């Protein structure tokens, strides 16, 4: 009613009190835009925010900043009372440091510069902790200041640009809810997974009697995966912050320092606190150290520590009102008996981010410093940093930007100010140019050891050329079963996997199947020869079975499988014969047993097919061939204009004359001819072949015509048979 | 039900008791066995207690198993007590446990079936407001059973509990967060099948189980022509079951079963799938993509157990296809008969397996072109069954099976295409309705709708699949 929700801010508005409120949500409260807001909730904790309208959000929730929820101690789904109030302006405000673990704070000047330009008309009240990041990644993070007294005290105030700010510097502690707590907005990563992991322990941990035996049996155990300590481990300590319960820490240095008889008693010692601190959550990231066991002999201490941890969870009736969870680096280094009942049951696999998911991870580490999202639209926006970066993680990105912060240092700090007192002039000099993040991309720091990865393409149909007959045919196969199915049940036709392609490598073929993934707004799963040759060398050929199971959750997604069968004929002859290879049969048998009707679309391609199984021609598997013709004059002209739109334009290049004489050039040749001869086109360089149409003709005589009528006839003979 | 005492040998106690603590505890739990006698002794720790393959797991592992052997030997076998044991799989067990003086009876607990799953579901069916007779079909367990494959009670329990959160997320969080339970939220609690279907689409289902069985849904109402083989399939399979007092009258010898050949899955995968339902027997399928799952996970030795698995599940038919496909790559085999090291376990077994059982040997392939001269000899694969391409009267019977699920209208004429094309097999007739049926009537805006030429347009693109030479090759290889 007045009760408008709190949430995790997508648009952050690094300036606090700038909290986003919907235009449709504010008209429900009958409060206009740009007014001072009074947030009042239980415990009589209050705070003031400024209304600014977002777009994608709806009236069901109001998406609020982290610290302003960290000021009122708000958890997702709480109850608040908000209304518009009178508007005033501050005069002179006094602030004080918050000293707990901080070891004092900033010494020198910047009481005006740093504070004033970051005020941006924040509504607030006396004794409120404001968060003002900026000026650098290292040494400056989100920092809270205790406000002592302002002249207009306790009344609604928006501190203005002409109002002075005084810093008392007298050491003190926080009045209201300082850091050491990490909110879900302060967390970043997979979005839907963050809500799915929490929702099982959400209701029990809040209140015991709200959800206890009602719906189901509460969670027994949870096993976590991924980079243990990239900030995946930070989530552990973070989850215990919103719940407010006790957080037990099972860590490496304690299990290593406690040998026989020290650790065995410590297992019951930490379990004794589990009953005393109950309700409490038990997080173990030591599953790798505790129970690596593949059933070999690691010594008696390894079998003793795991057998006790099994009995420690068995010694509990499952009600102390506590939840034991666990985490480990990967799908491996885990005891096989942990999946048996009486112990850990739920396993939630934590994956990696995507182009949008990386932006959420970057957004956490984006602001310690003076950057912006709406204030720099493109150049400093995270997506430009996301498309180049591949196979990273939060701590790697944190250490990468910190190393990239030294690029901002080496251009400023060493050769200018080596002094311990921090000047006021060096503060304006602190910015971040994209070149600092680009220099780390050229340097060797990027490394990807991750076996299984996914992606999404940029390719649309605007860069696509002719062959529109297959275009609407690709829409026929892929796009119909999604919207239609009540029509699909009307005809009653059977199911199927997907079509298959053939043609010279990457002519349009790698681009065509890459274009359909963007239009349907689905994901893109590519299984490619150079991508597979990375898999079976690192023993990931068994993980290919998991990639099959990986496609069903990421669905809708298309699976693109090419030249895995290239290694089939070497062991035994296979074209229509169908004797392939030991690992490849895992592809075959899976396609026979994989469920249809899913959002997966089977796609394959090859130069001339000439490797296959007679089962691959049969249904439930690879299906009717799609003939890729060589681009005709009207198709070539549509392809040539795609190649020459990025290059300069001039009558010197005529696309009509070369299109009439040559009917047989494929997509790769047309894509190749512009590469080297485009360097010869116009002036990129002093050579005398410039600004001529014959430069395309000179390379036209050197390159093969790629006109073969026999292989096209071989396609029609193998297709019907 | 027995009312006697139940002794619990568990994981957390054997892990918490190290040298000297567990050794005395073994006699301590055995001392209560004599005091609580009569009592039953259940050990699920055989995996932890005696995993031993004869390696060195340490002294405590050899000490705990040697005592448990003497603990049962220390008993005269009369305190009036029965010691039993349990473990995850056929493995992780001490080999000496099968010796006399100790555990003798071993009862293998398998997995459920479509009817057996309903019994397991029925236990977890009612904590909640569902029904069997009161909802006849939509909420009945068989509709949930046919989609679910390779699950177990606790997995089904945790699956429905996770599917209960689907019933929660549509009700509980956004309505009542209050600790006091309202009276109105009680009427709001039901279970729609979509909650159980959403878990089927989500990644939770996983099957790691090596050996599995199944039963089909296929009857002869969906089957087309070739009735000559129909009564011939009844001749082979169905006669020895009812007849045998007549079988002893003629005194004919035994045999394994026939074999099929034809383009993949035309009717051939459906025909052998139809006979299992009519006879009301079970169905055991050994298939190439099913075998390629076996020998990768080291289940090729369990194929010997699958042979022994067929005798208890009997009557059941064994369906074995394209295992011999990997035979010719190591050495040339068609009529030569040099196959492969794992495949000879198939051969030698069929020679030593007992006849007269309820097992029916069946095989199939596109063109046979891989075999052993022993596979042609008796006690093994037997007289070939020629699958002809469906004729006009056979195609019309097959086409009406494909178009009964699709709408009907004069726009689709089955007579004209049946007269011109005599050579289309079952897979082509099954394929032509797939993509061209999407073009049939209105499923979509394209202009090929409501025409008979859409079947004819795809008729010119698809191969005629008319080969007289391979049919002649069948007659030459069959007699020779």
From Swiss-Prot, chain B:
Temperature-related behavior of activity: Optimum temperature is 70 degrees Celsius.
Keywords for this protein: ATP-binding, Nucleotide-binding, Repeat
Cellular component terms (Gene Ontology): cytoplasm; intracellular membrane-bounded organelle
Superkingdom of the source species: Archaea
Signal sequence, start to end: none
GO molecular function terms noted in the UniProt entry: ATP binding; ATP hydrolysis activity
List of residues binding ATP: 262-269
Protein family membership: Belongs to the AAA ATPase family. CDC48 subfamily.
Subunit structure: Homohexamer. Forms a ring-shaped particle.
Protein's name according to its UniProt entry: VCP-like ATPase
UniProt source species: Thermoplasma acidophilum (strain ATCC 25905 / DSM 1728 / JCM 9062 / NBRC 15155 / AMRC-C165)
Gene: vat
Residues of the full protein shown: 247 to 726 of 745
């Amino acid at each position: 009613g007045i009760i408008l929700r709190v949430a995790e801010a997508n648009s952050t508005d690094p300036g606090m009190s700038r909290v986003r409120l919907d235009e449709s949500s504010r008209r429900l409260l009958d409060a206009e835009i740009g007014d001072v807001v009074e947030i009042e909730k239980v415990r009589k904790t209050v705070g003031r925010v400024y209304r600014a309208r977002p777009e994608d959000e709806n009236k069901g929730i109001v998406r609020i900043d982290s610290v302003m929820r960290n000021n009122c101690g708000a958890s997702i789904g709480d109850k608040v009372k908000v209304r518009k109030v009178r508007t005033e302006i501050a005069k002179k405000v006094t602030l004080a440091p918050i000293i707990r673990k901080d070891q004092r704070l900033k010494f020198g000047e910047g009481i005006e510069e740093y504070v004033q330009r970051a005020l941006i008309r924040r509504p607030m009240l006396e004794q409120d902790n404001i968060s003002v990041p900026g000026l650098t990644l290292a040494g400056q993070t989100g920092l809270l200041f205790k406000v002592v007294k302002t002249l207009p005290s306790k009344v609604p105030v928006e501190i203005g640009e002409e109002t002075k700010i005084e810093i008392r510097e007298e050491p003190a502690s926080e009045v209201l809810e300082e850091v050491s707590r990490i909110s879900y907005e302060d967390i970043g990563g997979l979005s839907e997974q963050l809500g799915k992991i929490r929702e099982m322990i959400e209701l029990p941990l809040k209140h015991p009697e709200l959800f206890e035996r009602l719906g189901i049996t509460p969670p027994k155990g949870v096993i976590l995966y991924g980079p243990p300590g990239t900030g995946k481990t930070l989530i552990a300590r973070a989850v215990a912050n919103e719940s407010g319960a006790n957080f037990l820490s099972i860590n490496g240095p304690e299990i290593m320092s406690k040998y026989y008889g020290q650790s065995e008693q410590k297992l019951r010692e930490i379990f004794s606190k589990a009953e005393e601190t109950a309700p409490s959550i038990i997080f173990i990231d030591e599953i790798d150290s505790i129970a690596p066991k593949r059933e070999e002999v690691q010594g008696e201490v390894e079998r003793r520590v795991v057998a006790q941890l099994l009995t420690l969870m068995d010694g509990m009736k499952e009600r102390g009102h506590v939840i034991v969870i666990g985490a480990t680096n990967r799908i491996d280094a885990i005891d096989p008996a942990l999946r048996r009942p009486g112990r850990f049951d739920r396993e939630i696999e934590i994956g990696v981010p995507d182009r949008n998911g990386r932006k959420e991870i970057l957004m956490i580490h984006t602001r310690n410093m003076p950057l912006g999202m709406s204030e720099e639209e493109k150049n400093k926006f995270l997506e430009e940093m996301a498309d180049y970066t591949y196979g990273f993680v939060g701590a790697d990105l944190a250490a990468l930007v910190r190393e990239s912060a030294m690029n901002a240092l080496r251009r400023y700090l060493p050769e200018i100010d080596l002094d311990k007192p921090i000047p006021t002039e060096i503060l304006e000099k602190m910015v971040v140019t994209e070149d600092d993040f680009k220099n780390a991309l050229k340097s060797i720091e990027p490394s990807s050891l991750r076996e299984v990865m996914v992606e999404v393409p940029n390719v649309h149909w605007d860069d696509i050329g002719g062959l529109e007959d297959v275009k609407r045919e690709i829409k026929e196969t892929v796009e119909l079963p999604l919207l239609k199915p009540d029509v699909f049940k009307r005809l009653g036709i059977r199911p199927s996997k997907g079509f298959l392609l053939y043609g010279p490598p990457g002519v349009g073929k790698t681009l065509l199947a890459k274009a359909v993934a963007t239009e349907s707004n689905a994901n893109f799963i590519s299984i490619k020869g150079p991508e597979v040759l990375s898999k079976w060398v690192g023993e990931s050929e068994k993980a290919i079975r998991e990639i099959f199971k990986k496609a069903k959750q990421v669905a809708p997604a298309i699976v693109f499988l090419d030249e895995i069968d290239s290694i089939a004929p070497r062991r035994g002859t296979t074209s229509d014969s169908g004797v392939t290879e030991r690992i490849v049969n895992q592809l075959l048998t899976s396609l026979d047993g994989i469920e249809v009707m899913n959002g997966v679309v089977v796609i394959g391609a090859t130069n001339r097919p000439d490797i296959m199984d007679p089962a691959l021609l049969r249904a439930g598997r690879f299906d009717k061939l799609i003939y890729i013709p060589p681009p005709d004059k009207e198709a070539r002209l549509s392809i040539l204009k795609v190649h020459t739109k990025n290059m300069p334009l001039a009558p010197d290049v005529d696309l009509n004359d070369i299109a009439q004489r040559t009917e047989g050039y494929v997509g790769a040749d047309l894509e190749n001819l512009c590469r080297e001869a485009g360097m010869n086109a116009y002036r990129e360089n002093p050579d005398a072949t410039s600004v001529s149409q014959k430069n395309f003709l000179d390379a036209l005589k050197t390159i093969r015509p790629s006109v073969d009528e026999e292989v096209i006839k071989f396609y029609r003979t193998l297709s019907e048979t």
